[PDB]
């Protein structure tokens, strides 16, 4: 059951937002937007397609954050020469996932950067 401004798809409420924010802020914003509020999670291709067209219908051609962050930070980074990774020199701290409203394809963008977003909750 969706508060008249949030849209419904399979028992969930979704809503796109205009003000560009970094990933962190956007995630935290969604939480304060509703009980159980979070940045959009795609559990299927059909949910993805719903959100994408919703986003386009609401704010046109732009880019929006999904609820996936620090994507590679926890991976197993190894120097091919088996040297211990001690010294670090990362240009960008961590990458987050976003989608462009033209399709449901997943793309990465540095989390500190701006993008619009879609929040969702269960109710």
């Amino acid at each position: 059951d969706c508060p008249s401004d949030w849209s419904s798809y399979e028992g969930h409420c979704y809503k796109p937002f205009s003000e560009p924010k970094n990933w962190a802020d956007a995630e935290n914003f969604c939480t304060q937007q509703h009980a159980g509020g979070h940045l959009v999670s795609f559990q299927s291709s059909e949910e993805a397609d719903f959100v994408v067209k919703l986003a386009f219908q609401t704010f046109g051609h732009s880019i929006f954050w999904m609820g996936l962050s620090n994507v590679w930070n926890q991976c197993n980074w190894q120097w091919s020469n088996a040297a211990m990774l001690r010294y670090k020199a990362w240009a960008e701290e961590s990458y987050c996932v976003y989608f462009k409203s033209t399709n449901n394809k997943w793309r990465s963008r540095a989390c500190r950067m701006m993008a619009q977003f879609v929040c969702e909750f269960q109710a």
Binding site: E27, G36, H38, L39, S41, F42, Q43, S44, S45, A48, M66, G67, L68, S69, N70, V71, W72, N73, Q74, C75, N76, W77, Q78, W79, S80, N81, A83, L85, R86, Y87, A89, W90, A91, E92, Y95, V97, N104, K105, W106, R107, S108, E120
Partner: protein
Amino acid sequence: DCLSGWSSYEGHCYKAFEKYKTWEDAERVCTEQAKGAHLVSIESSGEADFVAQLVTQNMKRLDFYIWIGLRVQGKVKQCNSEWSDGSSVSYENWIEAESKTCLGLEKETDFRKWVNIYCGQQNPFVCEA
């Protein structure tokens, strides 16, 4: 000591190659240079700057990323297993080129910082032995 055309730095030899190879192909060319040679491993600040200096002094074109030996082990598009809502990441739809799990150096950062790039890119590189 070092072979002709290779620069020494703290007990190692380095050589910049201006060939446009993918990460795996670049690593392969290093491995063919010597038993023990691989793409460069930046392990300290002084080494970072030596390499940075090597690149700007030897490469005729600084318009690309130069591959270094750091990358993700495995065939994983991302290592975060959960969405911010708790859910598990089962479904995914990545563009292959968006998984930037290989690293390189670039002019924007003076070849001192490591950048996340798609491993399938064709870039020049540095070998260390």
